[PDB]
């Protein structure tokens, strides 16, 4: 897939850019297109053939590409532009269309904040029921975009992990919780488990053990 920043943000009326970079078999050969998706709805094409704008797309939108990278730029930022943005292009190696990771765009209404990670060990009640579940709690973070990782000792656990999309709190600071479903044998056997949270390039980790 194409490497694009998970979160980018700017102040009302400012101009921000989303960078989409790929391999030489990707952007260099043919043109890159841009899509805008409001969460839970169908995407919309907002920039096609590098710099071309479909009818109905505001004049402030502009697209560009240089070599093996392309950057969508939006100006005169408005609340209307709050969405996830994707870049796409035809890739000759795969002989298909490749999409970007996805960039969440948010208009800053308050200063950036760091997440409050509090990792919870499995509750005694459910372990009595042969069910061990852990919950990592992320709160008071702004903007609402994070990356979560779960590791046992120093070995990452890739499956059984669920994460909720960030939601707003009564103070318009985002909150979300990633959780992992374990069997009691898994929970007791391993020495410890870690939850990893990534907010705007800064990563925090918390660890819990049965003791």
């Amino acid at each position: 897939v194409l490497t694009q920043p998970p979160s980018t943000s700017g102040t009302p009326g400012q101009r921000v850019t989303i960078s989409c970079s790929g391999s030489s078999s990707n952007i260099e050969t043919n043109t890159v297109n841009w899509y805008q998706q409001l969460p839970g709805t169908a995407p919309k094409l907002v920039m096609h053939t590098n710099n071309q704008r479909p009818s109905g797309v505001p004049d402030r939108f502009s697209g560009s590409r240089s070599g093996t990278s392309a950057s969508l730029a939006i100006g005169g930022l408005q609340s209307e532009d709050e969405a996830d943005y994707f870049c796409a292009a035809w890739d000759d190696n795969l002989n298909g269309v490749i999409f970007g990771g996805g960039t969440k765009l948010t208009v800053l209404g308050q200063p950036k904040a760091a997440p409050s990670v509090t990792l919870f060990p499995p509750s005694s009640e459910e372990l009595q029921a042969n069910k061990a579940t852990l919950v990592c709690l992320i709160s008071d973070f702004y903007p609402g975009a994070v990356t979560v990782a779960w590791k046992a000792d120093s070995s990452p656990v890739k499956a059984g992990v669920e994460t909720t999309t960030p939601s707003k709190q009564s103070n318009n600071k985002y909150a979300a919780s990633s959780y992992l479903s374990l069997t009691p044998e898994q929970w007791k056997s391993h020495k410890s488990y870690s939850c990893q949270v990534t907010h705007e390039g800064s990563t925090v980790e918390k660890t819990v053990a049965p003791t």
């Binding site: 408005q78 609340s79 208009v107 209404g109 308050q110 939601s167 009564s170 103070n171």
Partner: protein, 120 residues
């Protein structure tokens, strides 16, 4: 085409004052009645205030009665909502809403993009 743009929403401590600004385009501003609709985070729509075509009669919600002052500038096609002595319960997003009928009904054709107001 009809356009409705809100501004002025930001972060303030409780009891602070704020001024919201809404600009209209594409239709006779002085002809229709305007309104403010707000949505608390993770909560349903809540109603704030209306001002008639002339600006003669203003209605406020019971939760904000006597706290907010709604006003309009038909000459400049601009809508204002002055918010005084803000509480933390006012936290949310605020919308600008047009009205197509006489103005006594709750029917709004076009809504603004909105601005998010946070109080803590």
């Amino acid at each position: 085409q009809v356009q409705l743009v809100e501004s002025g929403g930001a972060l303030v401590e409780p009891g602070g004052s704020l001024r919201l600004s809404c600009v209209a385009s594409g239709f006779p501003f002085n002809e229709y009645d305007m309104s403010w609709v707000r949505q608390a985070p993770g909560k349903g729509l809540e109603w704030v205030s209306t001002i008639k075509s002339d600006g003669a009669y203003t209605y406020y919600g019971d939760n904000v009665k006597g706290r907010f002052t709604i006003s309009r500038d038909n000459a400049k096609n601009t809508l204002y909502l002055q918010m005084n002595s803000l509480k933390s319960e006012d936290t949310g997003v605020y919308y600008c809403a047009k009205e197509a009928r006489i103005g006594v009904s709750g029917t709004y054709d076009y809504w603004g993009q909105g601005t998010q107001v946070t109080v803590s």
